[PDB]
Design an enzyme around this catalytic site. Structure first.
Site, PDB file in Angstrom:
ATOM      1  N   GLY A  78       0.828  -1.221   0.000  1.00  0.00           N
ATOM      2  CA  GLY A  78       0.000   0.000   0.000  1.00  0.00           C
ATOM      3  C   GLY A  78       0.850   1.254   0.000  1.00  0.00           C
ATOM      4  O   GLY A  78       1.507   1.523  -1.021  1.00  0.00           O
ATOM      5  N   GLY A  79       0.821   1.990   1.106  1.00  0.00           N
ATOM      6  CA  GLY A  79       1.401   3.342   1.167  1.00  0.00           C
ATOM      7  C   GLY A  79       0.442   4.400   0.655  1.00  0.00           C
ATOM      8  O   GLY A  79      -0.715   4.106   0.326  1.00  0.00           O
ATOM      9  N   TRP A  80       0.924   5.627   0.571  1.00  0.00           N
ATOM     10  CA  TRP A  80       0.037   6.779   0.265  1.00  0.00           C
ATOM     11  C   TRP A  80      -0.663   6.582  -1.079  1.00  0.00           C
ATOM     12  O   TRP A  80      -1.881   6.814  -1.161  1.00  0.00           O
ATOM     13  CB  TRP A  80       0.852   8.065   0.290  1.00  0.00           C
ATOM     14  CG  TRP A  80       0.065   9.284  -0.067  1.00  0.00           C
ATOM     15  CD1 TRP A  80       0.001   9.882  -1.291  1.00  0.00           C
ATOM     16  CD2 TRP A  80      -0.763  10.067   0.809  1.00  0.00           C
ATOM     17  NE1 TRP A  80      -0.816  10.977  -1.240  1.00  0.00           N
ATOM     18  CE2 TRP A  80      -1.307  11.110   0.030  1.00  0.00           C
ATOM     19  CE3 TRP A  80      -1.124   9.983   2.159  1.00  0.00           C
ATOM     20  CZ2 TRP A  80      -2.146  12.082   0.568  1.00  0.00           C
ATOM     21  CZ3 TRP A  80      -1.973  10.933   2.686  1.00  0.00           C
ATOM     22  CH2 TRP A  80      -2.466  11.974   1.902  1.00  0.00           C
ATOM     23  N   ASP A 116       3.941  -6.113   5.858  1.00  0.00           N
ATOM     24  CA  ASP A 116       3.650  -4.828   6.546  1.00  0.00           C
ATOM     25  C   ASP A 116       2.452  -4.195   5.839  1.00  0.00           C
ATOM     26  O   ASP A 116       2.535  -3.922   4.631  1.00  0.00           O
ATOM     27  CB  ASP A 116       4.880  -3.924   6.537  1.00  0.00           C
ATOM     28  CG  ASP A 116       4.667  -2.556   7.143  1.00  0.00           C
ATOM     29  OD1 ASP A 116       4.359  -2.494   8.358  1.00  0.00           O
ATOM     30  OD2 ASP A 116       4.845  -1.571   6.403  1.00  0.00           O
ATOM     31  N   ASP A 118       0.387  -1.119   5.074  1.00  0.00           N
ATOM     32  CA  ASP A 118       0.473   0.368   5.102  1.00  0.00           C
ATOM     33  C   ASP A 118      -0.813   0.901   4.447  1.00  0.00           C
ATOM     34  O   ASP A 118      -0.775   1.338   3.274  1.00  0.00           O
ATOM     35  CB  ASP A 118       1.799   0.843   4.511  1.00  0.00           C
ATOM     36  CG  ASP A 118       2.081   2.327   4.668  1.00  0.00           C
ATOM     37  OD1 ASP A 118       1.203   3.058   5.194  1.00  0.00           O
ATOM     38  OD2 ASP A 118       3.166   2.752   4.226  1.00  0.00           O
ATOM     39  N   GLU A 120      -3.465   3.551   4.105  1.00  0.00           N
ATOM     40  CA  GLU A 120      -3.529   5.011   4.383  1.00  0.00           C
ATOM     41  C   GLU A 120      -4.814   5.593   3.803  1.00  0.00           C
ATOM     42  O   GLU A 120      -4.830   5.957   2.629  1.00  0.00           O
ATOM     43  CB  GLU A 120      -2.281   5.710   3.837  1.00  0.00           C
ATOM     44  CG  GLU A 120      -0.985   5.169   4.425  1.00  0.00           C
ATOM     45  CD  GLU A 120       0.264   5.994   4.181  1.00  0.00           C
ATOM     46  OE1 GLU A 120       0.133   7.100   3.632  1.00  0.00           O
ATOM     47  OE2 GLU A 120       1.360   5.534   4.583  1.00  0.00           O
ATOM     48  N   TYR A 121      -5.902   5.708   4.577  1.00  0.00           N
ATOM     49  CA  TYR A 121      -6.107   5.232   5.941  1.00  0.00           C
ATOM     50  C   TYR A 121      -7.531   4.697   6.027  1.00  0.00           C
ATOM     51  O   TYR A 121      -8.398   5.122   5.258  1.00  0.00           O
ATOM     52  CB  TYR A 121      -5.940   6.354   6.972  1.00  0.00           C
ATOM     53  CG  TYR A 121      -4.609   7.051   6.884  1.00  0.00           C
ATOM     54  CD1 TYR A 121      -3.470   6.476   7.424  1.00  0.00           C
ATOM     55  CD2 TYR A 121      -4.474   8.251   6.204  1.00  0.00           C
ATOM     56  CE1 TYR A 121      -2.232   7.071   7.292  1.00  0.00           C
ATOM     57  CE2 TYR A 121      -3.239   8.866   6.075  1.00  0.00           C
ATOM     58  CZ  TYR A 121      -2.121   8.275   6.627  1.00  0.00           C
ATOM     59  OH  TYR A 121      -0.892   8.855   6.515  1.00  0.00           O
ATOM     60  N   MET A 193       3.726   6.153  12.464  1.00  0.00           N
ATOM     61  CA  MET A 193       4.304   7.180  11.557  1.00  0.00           C
ATOM     62  C   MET A 193       4.211   8.534  12.266  1.00  0.00           C
ATOM     63  O   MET A 193       3.409   9.398  11.890  1.00  0.00           O
ATOM     64  CB  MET A 193       3.607   7.170  10.204  1.00  0.00           C
ATOM     65  CG  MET A 193       3.826   5.855   9.477  1.00  0.00           C
ATOM     66  SD  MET A 193       3.171   5.861   7.801  1.00  0.00           S
ATOM     67  CE  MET A 193       1.407   5.807   8.145  1.00  0.00           C
ATOM     68  N   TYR A 195       5.434  11.371  12.296  1.00  0.00           N
ATOM     69  CA  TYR A 195       6.017  12.420  11.419  1.00  0.00           C
ATOM     70  C   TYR A 195       4.902  12.850  10.469  1.00  0.00           C
ATOM     71  O   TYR A 195       3.755  12.390  10.615  1.00  0.00           O
ATOM     72  CB  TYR A 195       7.290  11.934  10.713  1.00  0.00           C
ATOM     73  CG  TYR A 195       7.195  10.590  10.037  1.00  0.00           C
ATOM     74  CD1 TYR A 195       6.489  10.412   8.859  1.00  0.00           C
ATOM     75  CD2 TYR A 195       7.863   9.492  10.552  1.00  0.00           C
ATOM     76  CE1 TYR A 195       6.425   9.180   8.222  1.00  0.00           C
ATOM     77  CE2 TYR A 195       7.807   8.257   9.930  1.00  0.00           C
ATOM     78  CZ  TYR A 195       7.090   8.094   8.762  1.00  0.00           C
ATOM     79  OH  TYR A 195       7.058   6.866   8.169  1.00  0.00           O
ATOM     80  N   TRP A 347      11.536   6.375   7.744  1.00  0.00           N
ATOM     81  CA  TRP A 347      11.276   6.645   6.304  1.00  0.00           C
ATOM     82  C   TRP A 347      12.276   7.688   5.833  1.00  0.00           C
ATOM     83  O   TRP A 347      12.196   8.822   6.290  1.00  0.00           O
ATOM     84  CB  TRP A 347       9.838   7.134   6.094  1.00  0.00           C
ATOM     85  CG  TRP A 347       9.517   7.357   4.651  1.00  0.00           C
ATOM     86  CD1 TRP A 347       9.757   8.476   3.910  1.00  0.00           C
ATOM     87  CD2 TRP A 347       8.964   6.387   3.752  1.00  0.00           C
ATOM     88  NE1 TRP A 347       9.379   8.271   2.613  1.00  0.00           N
ATOM     89  CE2 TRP A 347       8.901   6.996   2.482  1.00  0.00           C
ATOM     90  CE3 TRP A 347       8.522   5.066   3.896  1.00  0.00           C
ATOM     91  CZ2 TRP A 347       8.389   6.331   1.370  1.00  0.00           C
ATOM     92  CZ3 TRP A 347       8.039   4.409   2.787  1.00  0.00           C
ATOM     93  CH2 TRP A 347       7.960   5.038   1.547  1.00  0.00           C
TER      94      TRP A 347
END
Length: 367
Positions: A78-80, A116, A118, A120-121, A193, A195, A347
């Site tokens: 995944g990720g952004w 993992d 990820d 979002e979201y 995360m 940050y 990251w």
């Protein structure tokens, strides 16, 4: 006692010319490979030009595992940009099983030690293309359970233990939109995360990863929980056990241009858009800050002793840089130890070529 979880970006293998062979694996416990995509409800190779072909990053990570028996490599899904498939994948028992079986198939075929997530979201937040539904709150729990059961079964078949982790938002909306008290039991650890609290989505300057709330920072809609300690305390209260809570650190910085000085050398001031970056405007690698900007070339370092964060300001250009200074990072590493937390995550590893931050984290947490 402590984990050191480094994200490696597949696109490091392009213009950055930072390959898995460049990683100092002695400095980490885990590599998270960013990223696998989702297609038709299955985990798929994100980038055939560098992952399972072309520059062959996966081959290089398997080589690293042979050379470093301690090492655990996880595929980050995944990720952004690639989170749009999660809501559908999580929504039914059939979708969850299809997704989970594809995750097992992926780690077997490419030589990973786990997964993992990820996402979002869940429910709200993420990229313009992101997809949500209200049921995501419960479905995040159910997808995690399906994955853990599939990975348990596959590990028994394979004579291996497979890990299951997640990256969670620094924004406490994530906690309102998930069941962290129900799902924590199925994650080996949880990468917070801690940050992206401030950045060029705001027209005014601020800190990417302030340690604690600075009440002097009073810009519209940005409240008292946008800081590392608030995020950690929120996840602990939500039922993440301390030993599973891994504290995220950025190895990049954000920049604005044309910030007014005010009486704070550009801090919390109105600006005129993104500042200089490394690979894109407004985003600097630590390597670039360290070589070109840190008390260099008209950029002066300042320390906010409330936030416990450093910044750079160029009075000539009004450029303001938020970045992770060793002074701030040492405070965070002491805090990890004080609270009995799970270690540190960052990251991303390509962004610190001299390993200034990488080495401080390894020195403090590994032995």
């Amino acid at each position: 006692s402590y984990r050191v979880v480094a994200y490696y970006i597949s696109w490091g293998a392009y213009g950055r010319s930072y390959f898995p062979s460049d990683i100092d694996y002695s400095k980490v416990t885990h590599i998270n490979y960013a990223f696998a995509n989702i297609k038709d409800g299955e985990v798929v190779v994100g980038d055939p030009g560098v992952d399972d072909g072309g520059k062959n990053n996966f081959t290089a990570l398997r080589k690293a595992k042979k050379a470093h028996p301690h090492l655990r490599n996880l595929i980050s899904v995944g990720g952004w940009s690639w989170s749009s498939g999660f809501s559908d994948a999580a929504a039914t028992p059939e979708a969850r099983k299809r997704f989970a079986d594809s995750a097992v198939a992926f780690i077997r075929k490419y030589g990973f030690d786990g997964v993992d997530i990820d996402w979002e979201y869940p429910v709200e937040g993420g990229a313009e293309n992101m997809k949500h539904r209200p049921e995501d709150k419960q479905n995040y729990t159910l997808l995690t359970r399906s994955l853990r059961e599939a990975l348990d079964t596959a590990g028994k078949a394979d004579g291996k233990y497979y890990e299951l982790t997640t990256a969670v938002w620094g924004n406490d909306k994530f906690i309102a939109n998930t069941e962290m008290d129900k799902v924590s039991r199925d994650f080996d650890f949880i990468n917070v995360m801690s940050y992206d609290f401030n950045g060029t989505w705001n027209k005014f300057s601020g800190h990417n990863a302030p340690f604690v709330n600075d009440p002097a920072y009073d810009k519209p809609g940005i409240g008292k929980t946008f800081n590392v300690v608030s995020a950690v305390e929120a996840y602990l209260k939500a039922g993440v056990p301390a030993d599973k809570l891994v504290v995220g650190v950025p190895l990049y910085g954000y920049s604005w241009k044309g910030c007014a000085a005010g009486e704070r050398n550009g801090e919390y001031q109105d600006c005129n858009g993104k500042g200089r970056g490394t690979w894109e405007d407004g985003n600097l690698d630590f390597t670039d800050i360290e070589k070109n900007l840190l008390n260099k070339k008209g950029f002066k370092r300042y320390w906010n002793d409330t936030a416990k964060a450093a910044y750079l300001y160029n009075a000539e250009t009004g450029e303001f840089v938020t970045y992770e200074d060793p002074q701030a990072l040492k405070i965070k590493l002491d805090y990890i130890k004080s609270k009995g937390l799970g270690g540190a995550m960052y990251w991303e590893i390509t962004a610190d070529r001299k390993q200034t931050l990488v080495n401080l984290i390894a020195d403090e947490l590994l032995t």
